[PDB]
PDB file of C-alpha atoms in Angstrom:
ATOM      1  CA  UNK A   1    -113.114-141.463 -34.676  1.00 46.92           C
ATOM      2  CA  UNK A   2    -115.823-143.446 -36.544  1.00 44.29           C
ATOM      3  CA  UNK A   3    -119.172-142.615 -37.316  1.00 43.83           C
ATOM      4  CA  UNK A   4    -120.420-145.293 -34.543  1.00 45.80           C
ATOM      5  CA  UNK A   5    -122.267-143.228 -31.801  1.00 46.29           C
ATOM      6  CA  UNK A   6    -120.493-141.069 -29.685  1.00 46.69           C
ATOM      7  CA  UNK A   7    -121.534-142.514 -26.248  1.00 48.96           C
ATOM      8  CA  UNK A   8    -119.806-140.422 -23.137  1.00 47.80           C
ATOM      9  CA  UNK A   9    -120.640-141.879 -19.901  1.00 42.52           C
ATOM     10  CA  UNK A  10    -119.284-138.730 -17.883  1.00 43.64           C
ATOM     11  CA  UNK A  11    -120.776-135.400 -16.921  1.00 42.50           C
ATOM     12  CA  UNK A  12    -120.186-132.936 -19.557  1.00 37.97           C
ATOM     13  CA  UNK A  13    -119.315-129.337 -17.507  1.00 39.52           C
ATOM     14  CA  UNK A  14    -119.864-125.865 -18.344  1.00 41.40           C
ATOM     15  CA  UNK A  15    -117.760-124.617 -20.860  1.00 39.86           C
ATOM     16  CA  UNK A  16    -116.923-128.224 -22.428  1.00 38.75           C
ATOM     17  CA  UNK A  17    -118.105-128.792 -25.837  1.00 39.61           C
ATOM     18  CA  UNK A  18    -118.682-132.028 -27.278  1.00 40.25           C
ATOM     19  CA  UNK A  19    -119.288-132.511 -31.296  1.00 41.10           C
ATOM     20  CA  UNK A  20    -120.435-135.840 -32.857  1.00 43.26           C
ATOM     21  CA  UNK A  21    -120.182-135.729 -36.568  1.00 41.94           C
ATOM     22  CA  UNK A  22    -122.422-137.799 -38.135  1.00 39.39           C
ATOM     23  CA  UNK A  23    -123.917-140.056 -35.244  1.00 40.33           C
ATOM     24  CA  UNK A  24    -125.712-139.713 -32.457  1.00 40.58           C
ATOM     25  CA  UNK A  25    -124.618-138.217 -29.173  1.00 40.61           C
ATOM     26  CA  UNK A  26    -125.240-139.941 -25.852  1.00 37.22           C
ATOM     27  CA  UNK A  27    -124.085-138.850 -22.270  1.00 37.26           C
ATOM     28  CA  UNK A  28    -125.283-141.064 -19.639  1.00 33.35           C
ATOM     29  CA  UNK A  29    -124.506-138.080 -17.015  1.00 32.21           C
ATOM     30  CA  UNK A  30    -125.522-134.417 -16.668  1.00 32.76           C
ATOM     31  CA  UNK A  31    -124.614-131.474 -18.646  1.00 33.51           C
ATOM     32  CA  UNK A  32    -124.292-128.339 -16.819  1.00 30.79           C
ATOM     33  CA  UNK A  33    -125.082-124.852 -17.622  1.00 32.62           C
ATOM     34  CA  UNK A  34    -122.255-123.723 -20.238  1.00 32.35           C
ATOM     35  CA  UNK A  35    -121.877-127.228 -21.849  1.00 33.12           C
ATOM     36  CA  UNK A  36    -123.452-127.378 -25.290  1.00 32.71           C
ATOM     37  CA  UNK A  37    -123.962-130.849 -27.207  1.00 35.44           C
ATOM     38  CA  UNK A  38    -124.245-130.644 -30.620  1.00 36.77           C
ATOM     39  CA  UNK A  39    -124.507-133.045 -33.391  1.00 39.37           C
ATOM     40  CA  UNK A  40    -125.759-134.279 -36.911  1.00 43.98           C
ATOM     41  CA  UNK A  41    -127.932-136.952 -35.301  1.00 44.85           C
ATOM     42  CA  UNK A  42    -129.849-137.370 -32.090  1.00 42.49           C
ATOM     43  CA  UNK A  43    -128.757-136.080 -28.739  1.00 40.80           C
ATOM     44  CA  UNK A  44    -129.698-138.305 -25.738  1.00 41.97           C
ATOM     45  CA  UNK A  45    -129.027-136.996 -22.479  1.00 40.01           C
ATOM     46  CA  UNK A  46    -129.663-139.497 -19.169  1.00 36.09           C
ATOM     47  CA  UNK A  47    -128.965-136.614 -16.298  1.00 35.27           C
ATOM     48  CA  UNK A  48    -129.729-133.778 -15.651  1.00 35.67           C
ATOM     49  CA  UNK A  49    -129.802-131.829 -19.076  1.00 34.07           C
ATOM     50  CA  UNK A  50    -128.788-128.150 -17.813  1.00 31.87           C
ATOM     51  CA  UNK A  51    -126.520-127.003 -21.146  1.00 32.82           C
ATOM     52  CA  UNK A  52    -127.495-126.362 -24.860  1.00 35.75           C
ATOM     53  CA  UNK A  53    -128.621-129.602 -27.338  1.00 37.17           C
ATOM     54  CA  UNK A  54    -128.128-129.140 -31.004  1.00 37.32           C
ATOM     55  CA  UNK A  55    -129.022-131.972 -32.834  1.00 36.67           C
ATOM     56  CA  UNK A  56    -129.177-132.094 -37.060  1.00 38.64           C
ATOM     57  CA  UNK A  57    -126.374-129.905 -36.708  1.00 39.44           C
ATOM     58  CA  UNK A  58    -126.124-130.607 -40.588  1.00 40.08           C
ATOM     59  CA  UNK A  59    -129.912-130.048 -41.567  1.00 40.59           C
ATOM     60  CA  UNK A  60    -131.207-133.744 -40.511  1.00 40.08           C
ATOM     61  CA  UNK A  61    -134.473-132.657 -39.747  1.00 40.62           C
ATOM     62  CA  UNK A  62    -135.698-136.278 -38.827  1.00 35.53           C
ATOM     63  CA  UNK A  63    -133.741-136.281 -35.392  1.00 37.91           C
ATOM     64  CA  UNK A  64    -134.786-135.436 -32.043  1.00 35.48           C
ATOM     65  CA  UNK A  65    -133.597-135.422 -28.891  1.00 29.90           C
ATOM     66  CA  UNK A  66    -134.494-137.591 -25.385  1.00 29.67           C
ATOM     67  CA  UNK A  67    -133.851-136.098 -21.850  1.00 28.10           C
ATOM     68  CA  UNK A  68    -134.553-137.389 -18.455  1.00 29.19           C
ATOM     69  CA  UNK A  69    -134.334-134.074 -16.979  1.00 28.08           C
ATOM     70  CA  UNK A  70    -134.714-131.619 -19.239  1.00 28.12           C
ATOM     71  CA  UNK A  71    -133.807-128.000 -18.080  1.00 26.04           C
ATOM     72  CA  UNK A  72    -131.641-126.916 -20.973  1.00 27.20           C
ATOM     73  CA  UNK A  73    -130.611-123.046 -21.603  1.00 29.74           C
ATOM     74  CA  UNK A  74    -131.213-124.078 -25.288  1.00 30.60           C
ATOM     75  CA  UNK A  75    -132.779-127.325 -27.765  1.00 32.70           C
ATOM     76  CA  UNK A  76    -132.122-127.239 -31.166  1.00 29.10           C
ATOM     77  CA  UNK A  77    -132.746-129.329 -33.915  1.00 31.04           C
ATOM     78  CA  UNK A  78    -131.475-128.848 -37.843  1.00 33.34           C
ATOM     79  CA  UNK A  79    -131.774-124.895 -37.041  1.00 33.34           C
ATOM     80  CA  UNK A  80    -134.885-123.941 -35.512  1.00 32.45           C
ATOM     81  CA  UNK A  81    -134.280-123.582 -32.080  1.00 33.75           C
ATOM     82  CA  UNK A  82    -135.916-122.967 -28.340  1.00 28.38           C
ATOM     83  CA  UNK A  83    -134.720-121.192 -25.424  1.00 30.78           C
ATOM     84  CA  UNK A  84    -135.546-122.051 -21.840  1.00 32.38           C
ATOM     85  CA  UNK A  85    -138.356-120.043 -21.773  1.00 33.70           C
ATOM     86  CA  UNK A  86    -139.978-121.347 -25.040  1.00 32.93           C
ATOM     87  CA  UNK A  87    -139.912-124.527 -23.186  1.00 34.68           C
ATOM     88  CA  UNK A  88    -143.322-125.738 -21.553  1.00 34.36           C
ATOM     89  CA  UNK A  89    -142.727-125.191 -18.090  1.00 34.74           C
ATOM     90  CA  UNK A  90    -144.692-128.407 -17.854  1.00 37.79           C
ATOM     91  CA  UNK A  91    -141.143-130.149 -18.495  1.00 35.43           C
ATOM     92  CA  UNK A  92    -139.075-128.268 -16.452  1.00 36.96           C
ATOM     93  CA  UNK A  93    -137.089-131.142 -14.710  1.00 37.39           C
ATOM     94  CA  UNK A  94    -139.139-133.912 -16.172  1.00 39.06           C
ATOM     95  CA  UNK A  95    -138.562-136.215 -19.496  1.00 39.99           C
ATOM     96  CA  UNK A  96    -138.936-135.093 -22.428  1.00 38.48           C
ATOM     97  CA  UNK A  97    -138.778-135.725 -26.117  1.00 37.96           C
ATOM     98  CA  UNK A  98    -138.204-133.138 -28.451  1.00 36.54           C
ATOM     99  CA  UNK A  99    -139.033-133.252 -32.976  1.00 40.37           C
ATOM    100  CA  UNK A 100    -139.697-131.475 -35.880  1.00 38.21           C
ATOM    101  CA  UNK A 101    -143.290-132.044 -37.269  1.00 35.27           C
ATOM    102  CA  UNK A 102    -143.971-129.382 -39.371  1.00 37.13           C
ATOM    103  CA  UNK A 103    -140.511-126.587 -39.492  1.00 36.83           C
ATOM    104  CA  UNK A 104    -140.755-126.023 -35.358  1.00 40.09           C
ATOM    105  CA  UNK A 105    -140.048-128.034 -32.167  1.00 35.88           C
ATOM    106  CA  UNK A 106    -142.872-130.536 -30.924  1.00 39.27           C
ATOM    107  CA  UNK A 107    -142.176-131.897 -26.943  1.00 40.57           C
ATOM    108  CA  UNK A 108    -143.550-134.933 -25.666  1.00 37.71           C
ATOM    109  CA  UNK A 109    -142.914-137.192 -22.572  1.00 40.42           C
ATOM    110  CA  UNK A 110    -141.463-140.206 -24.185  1.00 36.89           C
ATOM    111  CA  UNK A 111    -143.388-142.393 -21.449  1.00 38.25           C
TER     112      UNK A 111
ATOM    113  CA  UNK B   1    -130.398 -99.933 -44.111  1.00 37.48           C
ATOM    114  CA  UNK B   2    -133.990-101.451 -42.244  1.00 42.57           C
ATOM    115  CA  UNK B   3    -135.570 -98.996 -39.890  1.00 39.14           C
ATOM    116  CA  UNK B   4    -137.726 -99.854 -36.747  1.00 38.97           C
ATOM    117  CA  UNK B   5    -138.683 -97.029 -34.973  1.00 37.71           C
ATOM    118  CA  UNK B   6    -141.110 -99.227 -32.708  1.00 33.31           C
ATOM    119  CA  UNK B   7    -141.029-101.580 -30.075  1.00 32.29           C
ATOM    120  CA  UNK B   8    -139.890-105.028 -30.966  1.00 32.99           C
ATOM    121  CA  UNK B   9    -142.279-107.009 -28.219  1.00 32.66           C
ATOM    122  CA  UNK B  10    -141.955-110.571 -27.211  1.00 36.04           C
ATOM    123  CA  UNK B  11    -142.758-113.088 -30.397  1.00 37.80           C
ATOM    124  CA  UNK B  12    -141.934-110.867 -33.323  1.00 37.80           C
ATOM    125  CA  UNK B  13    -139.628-111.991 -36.057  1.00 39.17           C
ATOM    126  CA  UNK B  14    -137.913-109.153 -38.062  1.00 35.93           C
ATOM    127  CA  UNK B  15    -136.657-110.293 -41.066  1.00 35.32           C
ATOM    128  CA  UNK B  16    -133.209-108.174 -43.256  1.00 35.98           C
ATOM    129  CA  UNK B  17    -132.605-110.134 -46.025  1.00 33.91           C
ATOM    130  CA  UNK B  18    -129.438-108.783 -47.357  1.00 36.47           C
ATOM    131  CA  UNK B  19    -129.083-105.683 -45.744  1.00 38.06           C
ATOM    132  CA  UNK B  20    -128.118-104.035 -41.857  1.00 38.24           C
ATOM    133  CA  UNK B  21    -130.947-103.525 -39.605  1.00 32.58           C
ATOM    134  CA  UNK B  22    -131.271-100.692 -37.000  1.00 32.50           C
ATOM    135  CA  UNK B  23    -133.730-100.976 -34.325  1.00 33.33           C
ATOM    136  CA  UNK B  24    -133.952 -97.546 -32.533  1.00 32.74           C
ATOM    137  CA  UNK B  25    -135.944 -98.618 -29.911  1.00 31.70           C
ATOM    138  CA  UNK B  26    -136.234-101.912 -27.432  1.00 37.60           C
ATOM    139  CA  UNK B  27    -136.436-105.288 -28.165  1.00 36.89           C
ATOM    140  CA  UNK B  28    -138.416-107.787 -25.826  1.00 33.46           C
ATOM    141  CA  UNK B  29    -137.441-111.706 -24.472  1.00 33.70           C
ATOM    142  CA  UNK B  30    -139.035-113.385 -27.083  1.00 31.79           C
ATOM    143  CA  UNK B  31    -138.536-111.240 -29.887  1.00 31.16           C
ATOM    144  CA  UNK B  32    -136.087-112.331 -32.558  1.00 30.99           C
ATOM    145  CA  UNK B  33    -134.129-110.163 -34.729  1.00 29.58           C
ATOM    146  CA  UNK B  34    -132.166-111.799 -37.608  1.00 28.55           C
ATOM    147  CA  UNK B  35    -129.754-110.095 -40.845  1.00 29.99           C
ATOM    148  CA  UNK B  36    -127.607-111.380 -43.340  1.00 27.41           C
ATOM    149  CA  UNK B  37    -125.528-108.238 -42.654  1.00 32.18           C
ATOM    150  CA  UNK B  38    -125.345-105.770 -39.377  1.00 33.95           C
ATOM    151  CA  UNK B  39    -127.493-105.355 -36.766  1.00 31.69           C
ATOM    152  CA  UNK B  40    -127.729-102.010 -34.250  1.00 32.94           C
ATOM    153  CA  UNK B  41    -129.853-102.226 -31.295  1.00 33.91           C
ATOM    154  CA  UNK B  42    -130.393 -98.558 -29.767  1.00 33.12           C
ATOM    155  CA  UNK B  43    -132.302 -99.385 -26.822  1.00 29.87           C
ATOM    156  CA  UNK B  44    -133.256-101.766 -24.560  1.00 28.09           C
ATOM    157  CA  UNK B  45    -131.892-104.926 -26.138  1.00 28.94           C
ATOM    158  CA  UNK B  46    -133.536-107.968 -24.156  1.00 28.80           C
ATOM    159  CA  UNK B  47    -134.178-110.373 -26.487  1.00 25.08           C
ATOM    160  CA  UNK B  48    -132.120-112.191 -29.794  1.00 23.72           C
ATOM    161  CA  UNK B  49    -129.913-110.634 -32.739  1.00 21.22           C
ATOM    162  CA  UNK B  50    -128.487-113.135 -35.582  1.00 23.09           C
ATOM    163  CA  UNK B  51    -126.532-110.966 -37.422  1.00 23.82           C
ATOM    164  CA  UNK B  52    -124.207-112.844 -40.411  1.00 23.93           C
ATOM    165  CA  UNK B  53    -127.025-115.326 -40.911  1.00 24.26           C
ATOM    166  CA  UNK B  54    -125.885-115.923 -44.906  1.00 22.98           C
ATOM    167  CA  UNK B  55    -122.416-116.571 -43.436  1.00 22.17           C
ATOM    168  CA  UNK B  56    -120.988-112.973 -43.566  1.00 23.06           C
ATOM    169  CA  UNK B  57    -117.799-113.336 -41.159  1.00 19.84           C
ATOM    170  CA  UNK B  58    -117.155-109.336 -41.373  1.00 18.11           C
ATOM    171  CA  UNK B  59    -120.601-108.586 -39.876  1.00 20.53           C
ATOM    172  CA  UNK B  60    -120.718-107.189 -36.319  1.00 22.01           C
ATOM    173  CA  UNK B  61    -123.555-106.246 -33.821  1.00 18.53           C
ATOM    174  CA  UNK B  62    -123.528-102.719 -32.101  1.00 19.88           C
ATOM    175  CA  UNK B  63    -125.198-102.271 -29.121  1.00 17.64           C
ATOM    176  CA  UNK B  64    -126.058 -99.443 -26.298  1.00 16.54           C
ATOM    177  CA  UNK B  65    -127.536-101.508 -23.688  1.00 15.04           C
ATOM    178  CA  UNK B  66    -126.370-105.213 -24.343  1.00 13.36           C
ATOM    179  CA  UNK B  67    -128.823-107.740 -22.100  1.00  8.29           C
ATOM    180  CA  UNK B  68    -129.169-109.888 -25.272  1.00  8.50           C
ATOM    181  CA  UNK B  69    -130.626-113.653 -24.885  1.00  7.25           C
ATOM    182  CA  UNK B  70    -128.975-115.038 -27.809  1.00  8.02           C
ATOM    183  CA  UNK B  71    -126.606-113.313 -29.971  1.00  6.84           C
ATOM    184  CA  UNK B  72    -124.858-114.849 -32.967  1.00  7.01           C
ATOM    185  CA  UNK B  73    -122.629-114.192 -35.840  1.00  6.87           C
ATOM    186  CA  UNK B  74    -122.157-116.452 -39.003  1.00  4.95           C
ATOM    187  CA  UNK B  75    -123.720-118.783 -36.649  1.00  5.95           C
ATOM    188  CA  UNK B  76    -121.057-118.093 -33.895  1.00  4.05           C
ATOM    189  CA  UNK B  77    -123.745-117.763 -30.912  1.00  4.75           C
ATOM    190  CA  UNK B  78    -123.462-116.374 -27.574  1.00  6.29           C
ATOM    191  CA  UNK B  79    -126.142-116.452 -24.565  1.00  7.99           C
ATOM    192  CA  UNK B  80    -126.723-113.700 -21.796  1.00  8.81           C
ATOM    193  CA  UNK B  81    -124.646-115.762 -19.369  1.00 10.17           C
ATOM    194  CA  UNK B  82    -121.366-116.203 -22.074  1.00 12.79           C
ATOM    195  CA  UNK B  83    -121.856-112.087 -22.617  1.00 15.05           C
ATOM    196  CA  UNK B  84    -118.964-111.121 -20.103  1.00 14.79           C
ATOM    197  CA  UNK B  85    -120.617-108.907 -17.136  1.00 14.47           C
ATOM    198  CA  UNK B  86    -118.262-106.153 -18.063  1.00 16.07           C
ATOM    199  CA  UNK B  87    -120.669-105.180 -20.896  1.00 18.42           C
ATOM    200  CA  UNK B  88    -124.112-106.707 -20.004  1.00 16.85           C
ATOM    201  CA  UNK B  89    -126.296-103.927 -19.894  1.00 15.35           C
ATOM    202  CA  UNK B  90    -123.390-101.195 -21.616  1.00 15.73           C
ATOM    203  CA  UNK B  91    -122.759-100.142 -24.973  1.00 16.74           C
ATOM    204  CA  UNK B  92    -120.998-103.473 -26.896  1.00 17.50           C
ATOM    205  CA  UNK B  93    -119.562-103.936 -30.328  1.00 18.15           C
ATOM    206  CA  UNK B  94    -119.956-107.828 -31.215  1.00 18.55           C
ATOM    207  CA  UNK B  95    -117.377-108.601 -33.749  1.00 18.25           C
ATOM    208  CA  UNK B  96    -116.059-112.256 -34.860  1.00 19.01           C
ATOM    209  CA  UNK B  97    -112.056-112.449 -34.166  1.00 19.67           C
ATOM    210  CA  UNK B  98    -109.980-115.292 -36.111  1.00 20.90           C
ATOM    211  CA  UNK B  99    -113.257-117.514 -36.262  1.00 20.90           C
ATOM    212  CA  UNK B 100    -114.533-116.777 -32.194  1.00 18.85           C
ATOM    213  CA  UNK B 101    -117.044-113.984 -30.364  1.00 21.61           C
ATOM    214  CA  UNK B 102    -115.226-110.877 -29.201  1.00 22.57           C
ATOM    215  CA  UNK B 103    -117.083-107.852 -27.537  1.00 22.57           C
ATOM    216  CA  UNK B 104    -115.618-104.067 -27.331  1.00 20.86           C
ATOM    217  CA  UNK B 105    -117.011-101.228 -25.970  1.00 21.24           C
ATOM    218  CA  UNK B 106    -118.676 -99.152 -28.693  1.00 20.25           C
ATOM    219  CA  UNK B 107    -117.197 -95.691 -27.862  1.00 18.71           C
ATOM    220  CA  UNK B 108    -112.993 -96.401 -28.619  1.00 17.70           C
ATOM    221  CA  UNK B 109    -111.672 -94.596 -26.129  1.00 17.73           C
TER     222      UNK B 109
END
C-alpha cells in the first residue's frame, strides 16, 4: 500500500475488481468481460482490454487511459462515461487512447 | 414526480433534479435516464437509469421489463450482463442492500 503505481502483471478475470487509490493502474495482461479497473489516475491496459476502465475515479479530469486492444464493456474517466457502443467501431480491437478535452471522452490511436 | 409519456429514443438525456421520474413508455440503447431520487420504467427499458445520483442510498429503480444497459444506484452500477437472467426482460425492483445491488421481483408474492 503506497501511492506508487499499482502495476499487476496478471490477467485480471471477470468478476475481479482491482482499485488503485491515488496512482495509476497498470495490467500488463488482459481484462475480461466482468473485470472492472478503476482508479484516481490513469488506467493502462497492455492485453486485451475486454472489462470496464474507470479512471479519475476521484474527479481528476486530466487522466486518460491507454489500451492495446481496446474492446471494453465500459471507459470512464472522472464521471462521464462510454459504453461499448459509444465506442468508434474504428477501435474495436485496436489501440487506443482515451481523454477529456472539453467535459466528454476524445479517442485517439496513441501511434 | 417527472412524467414522460413519450418515447425516450437513443441519445436523449432526461434530467430529475431532486425528484422520482416515471417514464411510461420505452426507453432506447443510447438513451440515458438519470434522478437524484427514484426512477420507474413502464415499458420497454433498453437503455440506462442512474437513480441516487446525489448519493441517496434509499432510492430504488422499479421496472416491468428490465433489459437495462447500465443501471446504477448512489453510484452502485450494474450492466445488462451483471442483471441476473432471472429478471432480464421481467418486472425488477433495484434496491441497494447493506452498501451492494439487489434485484426483486416487483409484484411480492
Amino acid at each position: 500500500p503506497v501511492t506508487k503505481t499499482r502495476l499487476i502483471d496478471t490477467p485480471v478475470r471477470s468478476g475481479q475488481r482491482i482499485y488503485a487509490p491515488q496512482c495509476d493502474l497498470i495490467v500488463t495482461s488482459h481484462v475480461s468481460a466482468g473485470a472492472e479497473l478503476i482508479a484516481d489516475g490513469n488506467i493502462h491496459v497492455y492485453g486485451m482490454m475486454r472489462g470496464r476502465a474507470l479512471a479519475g475515479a476521484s474527479g481528476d479530469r486530466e487522466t486518460q487511459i491507454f489500451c492495446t486492444n481496446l474492446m471494453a464493456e465500459l471507459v470512464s474517466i472522472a464521471g462521464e462515461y462510454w459504453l461499448s457502443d459509444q465506442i468508434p467501431a474504428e477501435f474495436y480491437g485496436k489501440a487506443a487512447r482515451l481523454q477529456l478535452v472539453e467535459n466528454a471522452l476524445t479517442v485517439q490511436p496513441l501511434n
